């Protein structure tokens, strides 16, 4: 086949793999940030749910 075959195929392959590479770098940086700060959708850690708390008036007034 002609040289344009390899030229356009290499264009597509190079673009796709470069996108993969800097996406991987962004993944590493995002993971570091989200593990360090936790202000993100993942890396959340379990905490006690508030709905278990009971608010009815107890025997002791100033509980």
């Amino acid at each position: 086949d002609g040289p344009e075959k390899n030229y356009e195929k290499t264009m597509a392959i190079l673009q796709i793999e470069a996108e993969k590479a800097e996406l991987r770098l962004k993944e590493l940086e995002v993971r570091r940030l989200m593990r360090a700060r936790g202000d993100g959708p993942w890396y959340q850690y379990p905490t006690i749910d508030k709905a278990l708390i009971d608010h009815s008036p107890k025997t002791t007034p100033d509980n």
Binding site: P3, Y7, T10, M11, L14, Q15, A18
Partner: protein, 173 residues
């Protein structure tokens, strides 16, 4: 012919005409005549046969054009598309320059053979041409390593430009 005197200079072909004044006649004459009669004529007529056969059907072909693309200096830092374009353009430019020095080497070897013993006297005109070709080829493409690339060539070029700029600045005040 198949090559211009612009692309492959050829000194004018001049041959002397000896006069065999001696009664003894030179034998090499008879050798040229018999070789022409029973070798040159049959190969020529067979060549005419196959050449008219070739001219019966002559399919055509052309040169492969190469539209120029932006250079690596114009190419942005870590932009794989234009990087590929510039790298291939620079690779083919390196190939064409290699063939340039090859052409000059062939021309100057031809010069040496034409001038024979007087090669030193009658080849300096092209000797200096091959000298400058190789000298600038060294600073244009050499020392780039096995993994030579457009970026490495640009880096070497840049280093040369800083060197010359600094030297000219310090030397000339």
């Amino acid at each position: 012919d198949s090559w211009d005197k612009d692309v492959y200079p050829e000194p004018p072909r001049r041959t002397p005409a000896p006069a065999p004044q001696t009664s003894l006649p030179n034998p090499v004459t008879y050798l040229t005549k018999i070789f022409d009669l029973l070798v040159d004529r049959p190969v020529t007529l067979a060549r005419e046969f196959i050449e008219q056969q070739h001219a019966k059907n002559r399919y055509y072909y052309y040169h492969r054009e190469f539209r120029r693309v932006p250079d690596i200096t114009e190419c942005e830092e870590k932009d794989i598309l234009c990087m590929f374009e510039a790298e291939m353009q620079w690779r083919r430019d390196y190939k064409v320059d290699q063939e340039i020095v090859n052409i000059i080497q062939e021309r100057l070897k031809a010069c040496q053979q034409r001038e024979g013993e007087s090669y030193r006297q009658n080849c300096a005109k092209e000797l200096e041409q091959f000298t400058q070709v190789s000298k600038a080829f060294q600073d244009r493409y050499s020392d780039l390593g096995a993994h030579y690339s457009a970026r490495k060539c640009l880096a070497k070029q840049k280093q040369r430009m800083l060197a010359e700029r600094k030297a000219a600045k310090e030397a000339a005040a």
